[PDB]
Amino acid sequence: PVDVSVSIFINKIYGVNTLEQTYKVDGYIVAQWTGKPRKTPGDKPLIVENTQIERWINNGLWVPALEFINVVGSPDTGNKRLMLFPDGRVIYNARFLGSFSNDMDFRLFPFDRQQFVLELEPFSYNNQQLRFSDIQVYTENIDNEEIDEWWIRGKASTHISDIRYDHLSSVQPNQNEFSRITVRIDAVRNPSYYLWSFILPLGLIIAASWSVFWLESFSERLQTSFTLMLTVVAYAFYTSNILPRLPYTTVIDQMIIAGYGSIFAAILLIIFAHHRQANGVEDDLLIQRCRLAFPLGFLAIGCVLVI
Amino acid sequence: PVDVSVSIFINKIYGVNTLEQTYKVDGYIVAQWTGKPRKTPGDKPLIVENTQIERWINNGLWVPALEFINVVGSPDTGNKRLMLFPDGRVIYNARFLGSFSNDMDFRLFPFDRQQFVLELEPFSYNNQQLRFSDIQVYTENIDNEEIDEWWIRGKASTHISDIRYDHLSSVQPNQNEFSRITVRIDAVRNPSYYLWSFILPLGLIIAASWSVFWLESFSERLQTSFTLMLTVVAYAFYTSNILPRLPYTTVIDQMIIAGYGSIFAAILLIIFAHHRQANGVEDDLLIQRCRLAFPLGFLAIGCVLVI
Amino acid sequence: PVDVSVSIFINKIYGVNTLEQTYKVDGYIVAQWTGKPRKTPGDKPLIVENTQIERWINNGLWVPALEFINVVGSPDTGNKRLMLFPDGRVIYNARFLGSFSNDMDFRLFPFDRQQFVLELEPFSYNNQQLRFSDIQVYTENIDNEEIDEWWIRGKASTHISDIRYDHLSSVQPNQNEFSRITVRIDAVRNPSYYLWSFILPLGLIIAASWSVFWLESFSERLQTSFTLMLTVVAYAFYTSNILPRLPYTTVIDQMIIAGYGSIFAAILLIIFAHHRQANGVEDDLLIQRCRLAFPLGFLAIGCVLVI
Amino acid sequence: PVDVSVSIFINKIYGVNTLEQTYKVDGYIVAQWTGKPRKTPGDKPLIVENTQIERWINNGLWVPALEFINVVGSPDTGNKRLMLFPDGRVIYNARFLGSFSNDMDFRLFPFDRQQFVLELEPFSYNNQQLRFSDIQVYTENIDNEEIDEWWIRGKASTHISDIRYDHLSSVQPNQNEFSRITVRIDAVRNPSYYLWSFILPLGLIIAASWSVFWLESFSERLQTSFTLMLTVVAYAFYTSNILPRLPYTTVIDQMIIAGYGSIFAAILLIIFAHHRQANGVEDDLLIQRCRLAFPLGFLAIGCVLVI
Amino acid sequence: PVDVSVSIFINKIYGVNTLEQTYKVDGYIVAQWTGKPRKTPGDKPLIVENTQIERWINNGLWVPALEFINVVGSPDTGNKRLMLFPDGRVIYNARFLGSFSNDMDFRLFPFDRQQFVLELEPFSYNNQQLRFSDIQVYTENIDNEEIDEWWIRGKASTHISDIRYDHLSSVQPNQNEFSRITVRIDAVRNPSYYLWSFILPLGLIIAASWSVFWLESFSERLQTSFTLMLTVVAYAFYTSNILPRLPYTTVIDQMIIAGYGSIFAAILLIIFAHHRQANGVEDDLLIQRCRLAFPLGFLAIGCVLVI
Ligand SMILES: CN(C)CCCN1c2ccccc2Sc2ccc(Cl)cc21
Ligand SMILES: CN(C)CCCN1c2ccccc2Sc2ccc(Cl)cc21
Ligand SMILES: CN(C)CCCN1c2ccccc2Sc2ccc(Cl)cc21
Ligand SMILES: CN(C)CCCN1c2ccccc2Sc2ccc(Cl)cc21
Ligand SMILES: CN(C)CCCN1c2ccccc2Sc2ccc(Cl)cc21
Known part of the structure; x- marks a missing residue:
């Protein structure tokens, strides 16, 4: 044998x-x-x-x-x-x-x-x-x-x-x-290249997304939102083309949905702020000061993505 | 034998x-x-x-x-x-x-x-x-x-x-x-990856398209429309590049036309709202309140796409 | 033999x-x-x-x-x-x-x-x-x-x-x-897939391009034009990437030039409207009502592309 | 032998x-x-x-x-x-x-x-x-x-x-x-396909770029410039993706820089016009009438690219 | 032997x-x-x-x-x-x-x-x-x-x-x-092609980014920022697609992060300028005149990337 x-x-x-x-x-x-x-x-x-x-x-x-x-x-x-x-x-x-x-x-x-x-x-x-x-x-x-x-x-x-x-x-x-x-x-x-060149840029994009709340008007807020929307779709595209194709969602791929998310949630507030009022047109006083309350809410939900 | x-x-x-x-x-x-x-x-x-x-x-x-x-x-x-x-x-x-x-x-x-x-x-x-x-x-x-x-x-x-x-x-x-x-x-x-990362973002995009009716002006409405247009074209591109190339239309591919559709119908309304008036310039009162009537019409047409 | x-x-x-x-x-x-x-x-x-x-x-x-x-x-x-x-x-x-x-x-x-x-x-x-x-x-x-x-x-x-x-x-x-x-x-x-998903969206895009004339201002008209310009460039890219590469112009490829054309002709009109005036600043009365005269002019030239 | x-x-x-x-x-x-x-x-x-x-x-x-x-x-x-x-x-x-x-x-x-x-x-x-x-x-x-x-x-x-x-x-x-x-x-x-479908659109883009000087305001000019900027980058990408990859600059590749150039030169003028003044804020009278002086300057430099 | x-x-x-x-x-x-x-x-x-x-x-x-x-x-x-x-x-x-x-x-x-x-x-x-x-x-x-x-x-x-x-x-x-x-x-x-056609355009883009500080309003500044954001994401995509894929950051790849950076730093300044005031709304006098102080700071940090 x-x-x-x-x-x-x-x-x-x-x-x-x-x-x-x-x-x-x-x-x-x-x-x-x-x-x-x-x-x-x-x-x-x-x-x-x-x-x-x-x-x-x-x-x-x-x-x-x-x-x-x-x-x-x-x-x-x-x-x-x-x-x-x-x-x-x-x-x-x-x-x-x-x-x-x-x-x-x-x-x-x-x-x-x-x-x-x-x-x-x-x-x-x-x-x-x-x-x-x-x-x-x-x-x-x-x-x-x-x-x-x-x-x-x-x-x-x-x-x-x-x-x-x-x-x-x-x-x-x-x-x-x-x-x-x-x-x-x-x-x-x-995980250097993908952080230093994909993870990071996307965070800045999502971060800068929140700065929509420091626009004075409402037309300013809602219109600018659509450019942020475009920015993610652009960055989703950039991500997808270069990163390895898969049949499931990657970590990066989730963060991209988180982008798509925060921005679309902004839209709702931005509009609901306008039409939750005491008169016909009063942006709700406290609400459009979720300026430093969206970052926290996103970061809170971004620590349950981990566990 | 044999x-x-x-x-x-x-x-x-x-x-x-x-x-x-x-x-x-x-x-x-x-x-x-x-x-x-x-x-x-x-x-x-x-x-x-x-x-x-x-x-x-x-x-x-x-x-x-x-x-x-x-x-x-x-x-x-x-x-x-x-x-x-x-x-x-x-x-x-x-x-x-x-x-x-x-x-x-x-x-x-x-x-x-x-x-x-x-x-x-x-x-x-x-x-x-x-x-x-x-x-x-x-x-x-x-x-x-x-x-x-x-x-x-x-x-x-x-x-x-x-x-x-x-x-x-x-x-x-x-x-x-x-x-x-x-x-x-x-x-x-x-059908996990494609919903969580393609179907969903597209819906959010088409949904946010309808929020064009909550813009106050008419110039705001009509101009913003063209940015939505770009947003779909961008998202159509992103879709096309990553998804498997075929000689027929997929389900996703139809939804992409539904976007292209809703947005161009908006443009018509947005413009037809402006010039269906009693004076020279009166935006037609009820019509620009198809705010929660486009979503229903789209969802109605999106339940006959199924059968 | x-x-x-x-x-x-x-x-x-x-x-x-x-x-x-x-x-x-x-x-x-x-x-x-x-x-x-x-x-x-x-x-x-x-x-x-x-x-x-x-x-x-x-x-x-x-x-x-x-x-x-x-x-x-x-x-x-x-x-x-x-x-x-x-x-x-x-x-x-x-x-x-x-x-x-x-x-x-x-x-x-x-x-x-x-x-x-x-x-x-x-x-x-x-x-x-x-x-x-x-x-x-x-x-x-x-x-x-x-x-x-x-x-x-x-x-x-x-x-x-x-x-x-x-x-x-x-x-x-x-x-x-x-x-x-x-x-x-x-x-x-x-010729199903390419019409329902390429020809048609382009037409809708080109059509909506003409709606630039229904913008009230001139700044509105001229600025929005550049977004239309971008919209075509985006759609040209989307087209080019997915479609079969060739050494001549396809039918689709011609339609894409027609976009590039109407939009740049719009720019000319939109601007020539402004400065073909009786005073210093009078948008020429009839001209910016090529609203339903550009669609006709485009469709006329699109019946000599056929023969 | x-x-x-x-x-x-x-x-x-x-x-x-x-x-x-x-x-x-x-x-x-x-x-x-x-x-x-x-x-x-x-x-x-x-x-x-x-x-x-x-x-x-x-x-x-x-x-x-x-x-x-x-x-x-x-x-x-x-x-x-x-x-x-x-x-x-x-x-x-x-x-x-x-x-x-x-x-x-x-x-x-x-x-x-x-x-x-x-x-x-x-x-x-x-x-x-x-x-x-x-x-x-x-x-x-x-x-x-x-x-x-x-x-x-x-x-x-x-x-x-x-x-x-x-x-x-x-x-x-x-x-x-x-x-x-x-x-x-x-x-x-x-050289048919590449002219009728690449050279030409890019020129129209660069041409329409100059129409930035026919915007009334300064905020209008400078902001619109950035959209022109975006338009070239878009067109550069479209160019790069479809054209044969090389280790040198093609003719098209140069024209793409010419876009990048005129637009950034516009930015400089547009801004220098604003602050080369007699008071605090007077746009310099003759300079923002380089309307038909940039096309000439570009076309002059585009006749020394040839020899 | x-x-x-x-x-x-x-x-x-x-x-x-x-x-x-x-x-x-x-x-x-x-x-x-x-x-x-x-x-x-x-x-x-x-x-x-x-x-x-x-x-x-x-x-x-x-x-x-x-x-x-x-x-x-x-x-x-x-x-x-x-x-x-x-x-x-x-x-x-x-x-x-x-x-x-x-x-x-x-x-x-x-x-x-x-x-x-x-x-x-x-x-x-x-x-x-x-x-x-x-x-x-x-x-x-x-x-x-x-x-x-x-x-x-x-x-x-x-x-x-x-x-x-x-x-x-x-x-x-x-x-x-x-x-x-x-x-x-x-x-x-x-290093010819990559400078003349990639390095250079990107610098002009980053440079023109700084011209955001010469916008008069604050809404003008903050909104335009998001268009700059889009511009970089676009240019990162263009870069990534054409340049050789690697598992580390190239020099070009870093410059792209510097873009992402300056633009996101601008947003903070632009916003902090607005809300570092003596009253409720006074854009901080000296600060939004980092017009020729961002270029120096970027170039100063761009001389320590070398050593
Ligand atoms: C998750 N596990 C069912 C693995 C399935 C993957 N794999 C597969 C791939 C593409 C299309 C159809 C199939 S079926 C199949 C049948 C037998 C074997 Cl041995 C492998 C496969
Ligand atoms: C349902 N029918 C369209 C089937 C024909 C498809 N297939 C085909 C594909 C591309 C170009 C030409 C042809 S002809 C042809 C001739 C013999 C056979 Cl066996 C297959 C084909
Ligand atoms: C119009 N007809 C000259 C066809 C040109 C195509 N073709 C070709 C392709 C790429 C580079 C060089 C050539 S030359 C040539 C010489 C002999 C033959 Cl049989 C074909 C070719
Ligand atoms: C410009 N001429 C030096 C041609 C160099 C091109 N080629 C080359 C390509 C990629 C990496 C290294 C080299 S070296 C080399 C050595 C011998 C020969 Cl026969 C060809 C080459
Ligand atoms: C830093 N060094 C780990 C480099 C090695 C990279 N390389 C490698 C590549 C992809 C996946 C796994 C490996 S392990 C490995 C084991 C033996 C040898 Cl000879 C090469 C490799």
Whole structure:
């Protein structure tokens, strides 16, 4: 029941695809497993590069297809070598680049925590078993990830479990448990750019929205409101175009509704102030001095968005 | 004849293409059919991975080409294996990723019901027949599909029918009926994001449009109208850019015309109010008090849009 | 001088590319031609699927390369089979998906008439001749093409002509005429979506533009004009972003200039009204009552855009 | 020292990539060169299609690799044939589609002159020499290029030169001259669409900008200015989004700055008019009658942009 | 311990991908290494083109797989030849196009200094050693790079170092040092287009923002502010859409915050001017004459953004 040692060097993780829940991984994979000893030229181990490998299989060299359970489409394989040893053991080494899939919650958008994952498992073997898994990452955190998009927290999570697959296990009675290496890296989104360039501007916009109450007239107040309305729609548009498209509301996306909200609530007061009066036309004395009472009400409702 | 058993494990459905009427499906396919018994090493069934399979065909191993009738372009095949059994039976197992086509009506956009479908059929065989079809999906609904885009309703629809193909059936008299497995999964779009972030803001915009009638002057009313106009045009643009492009009007797209409508009707009234008078310049008393009569008229017309 | 029968099943026409003048076609092609009789296993015709076909050629099986003259780049071939008959005749069957090119005039944009075309011709043979061509489409019109983008008018146009190629016809004296099947289907664009959601809103915008003359002041008129100006620029952008990019002006594109025009003509009038006076400041009495004279002038010039 | 005749049929030039300085070319290439006579079946020349060609090379048929020096990435080769003649001569014929590179100055954008270029050269041969080059283009100009994007001026420019490659010419002393066919077609951009739909609207915008001086007040002038400001930014965005992205300023891009300019110069005057006075508040009499002095000043500076 | 000479011809560097930190490089690679002498036809060196090379490997011709350590995904290889010499030495020559990765700091965006790099290293060999590296670039700077995007500063940096790889060096005790050629060219972004068409317009916008203080009223000042607000949001959008997307703030991106700032600071002043009074309503005399005190304060804070 073959023992297989696996090592995965991760070179670069890039291009998140928020809608598809998808990321790209470039790196090498290495499998080691000891076979029947053989004679090599010299006694030095034998090297078999790329195209040559497939020919060695046509002569009965077994090389297991190791599948990336969670890759979306067969990955781009760059170079591959076999290292055949005189004492039997064999090393398969190949570089890959593949688009991998995992579940990703983006609802806390500018302040994400995500988990990038690889799942390796032999494509047709249940008593060939993944001996031990080792993943080599060569980075540093908190660090250069002001230049880089993501903040890794954890380093090394491994598994190597056994997967059941209870469907048509009578195709082969008593044996359908496959050996699955699971590799998972934890990361945090860098919430600088989105605060410094999206969160902040929007707040100023919502803030300046409230300054509508310090207009003297009523016509001034109500008309200016419509320009504030336009300003949010504009800023909603600006937000939407640049930010990652999703099927749920982000934090930013909520704040944008909060904008749409405060402004439309203003409209109501501004008008109800005019027509809650003792005569025909008296702006209600205290009410249009919600000047420093809208900011508080918004900020009060903006601390229950948090919990 | 030949009886062929088929099993389809569905791993992921993603990336709908509204314009092309197209979706992406990643999963495995398994075919099983019993052939002439053979001698395998040991008596254990024989495994043939990838490249090696094509070599076994050059020696007369028949392996039927199974086509995805409704795939748009040949799909990306990841790994494939044969399981040759000593008692004859043979198992073909391969992972696929393909862009599939089906008829898709998107006119009720934020509230979709769709039917994602696979059609499998042998490419050159009419008395080789699909024994039984089984589809293995491992998800759950209503559930995580707040994080996920779609709500699956039904589970398992299968068919396995016979297709006629009456065109040049004299090429082979009396026999042109092909065995077609049909798999179809029903799903609903998650109308959360689009209401909370598109439907709602637009309504607030259309609502605030009506507040034009609570402006005192006429110059105020008519001028402000044009800013509302801009506001919709802006919001139409924002809508268009982010939402899926189509060749028909969505529900949202209608509401956007309702905006364009209410605003241009306002302009007419606002102007007709001014010059339907007893003197030269008397704004018609009751009419500019369609303040709470446009909302009713719009909401009345917005309850016949439903039926 | 070989006779070749051809049949083309068209499965889907999708993804027009206005700029490249390009469309995608998925379907099957079938070629039939009678050769020297042979012994088949049994007397049943022999089936040769995909990879195996190329092996049969290495043994002297001639299979002519049929080129798609008007495909842009080698197409995606899905599955291919040979049907070798004991009485000699041979059937080549393969599914294709390819991006095809044809001349396409889009100047009458939302009201297009287009002609989608396939051109087949052997790549190196002049006395091998296309016997007869048959095209199988299974759709219906006027019908589902409210859900579908295009209205097919004609059904079936075929040709099968002879092409000259007078360039280096001394490379082979007296024989350079190639047999070319030409298939062309006529279709009309579905002018619903673009009217109900683009043409109409623009008209309402342009109409409301004229309501500038019903502003009492002159400052009101001239200032409001600039908001109308902005309104068009906004709507031009909205138009441009969503509509298919082209190297000529569409019908919609003309209407957008008419906006830019009337508004700038308004500016001129609005200002010329002010300073064509008997005193220093008398708005010219009749002129700013081009209220229901601009609409007429615009509509008159919009009936010579048609002829 | 082999003489090679080449002919290049050009089918379509499309999809310019302004940023990458890149265009797509679909067409056929044919190479002819006389070799040692051979026996063909019959005495008719022998045809070798596609896959069969590579097999004929495995038996010592020499077919020179002809490289497209200026293709960006190996091109899509569709079909290839050999025509082996009994008297020796051999014809290589293949269809290609490739993305080609050349230097492209787009600074005079809507009024471009460009030169689309092919460079062919053997990949490993210096005394195999390109006998003569012939290029077959089948179009017409000035003509259909209102429907088409470009105006070809010249027809056929050819070269066929000798390239030195003085770097490691001691790898092979005295002989490093490669034979390079160079083909270049001159073309002009069709400056209709960009004038009728971009240049013109912007001028109207800039023109109407000057009508700010015909506003009576000062508050009217300065406030309206900011709306003009907004109008240009709007039009700049619309411009930028639709027009080809570049690393330099186009003509349009300059005109867009001219808008930004006149409007900000207006602001200065409008304000300087107010406070260059004899009392506290007297708008300077002659200056705000730069009404027909800004258009002149702009038009004067717009005649030195030309030379 | 094989000595290998390498030469790298760089044909084109294009298509920077700011987000992925990635650029495209088209060029040729040449490897030379002296092997066991052999008999060639004639005594002229032997040429082996493309497909033929792989056949020569099946007969024991060793040709080392040279990997591009920093290429993202296996690169597009166009043409490859071997030049086998009678005296043993062998030349591998092939054209490549690949997307290469390197660390790229874009925080000083319109004024970048970047370093485009190739890292070559054998895929499975430690005592086969890269003798010397030579890179051939044929361009010129400062020059055509007004038409071109980038300014190369340095010419030629080479290395050829030894890499440790201390992980599973017991897989082969005492020998895990690989020979790595490193090539790096230094380049600067062309800060013309981004100043003349983005930086400049924005300054005029921020400048004209300050002219809000020269409005006579308070209602005039506060209302106009909101139009300025809209103006920036518009210009941020225009910027964001066209400029390269990043996960940090560019210089331009900061200037956009400065706009958002000055305008929101204006609003406070404008309002605090109104309500810092001796009576109920006296605009504070000196304060709304921060007319030429906001420009100084902004420029003062705009000289500490630099250091
Ligand atoms: C500051 N450093 C964390 C930069 C690393 C960025 N990069 C990355 C990108 C997107 C999501 C997750 C990651 S983690 C990671 C792990 C290994 C390597 Cl080699 C690269 C990465
Ligand atoms: C929330 N969970 C129901 C996930 C559903 C996502 N996914 C999907 C995507 C777009 C349209 C329809 C579907 S249905 C479906 C059926 C089976 C599987 Cl395995 C995945 C999917
Ligand atoms: C309901 N009907 C409109 C269906 C036709 C749609 N489809 C199509 C699309 C774009 C342009 C032209 C066509 S024609 C056509 C011909 C054959 C087939 Cl199989 C499909 C199509
Ligand atoms: C009006 N007809 C000259 C069509 C022009 C289109 N076309 C083209 C497109 C972009 C850049 C350059 C050219 S030139 C050219 C040369 C040969 C052929 Cl076959 C087509 C073209
Ligand atoms: C103006 N001329 C220096 C052209 C430089 C353009 N190109 C380039 C593009 C983007 C980033 C860096 C470079 S450097 C370079 C080095 C060699 C060659 Cl062949 C082309 C380039």
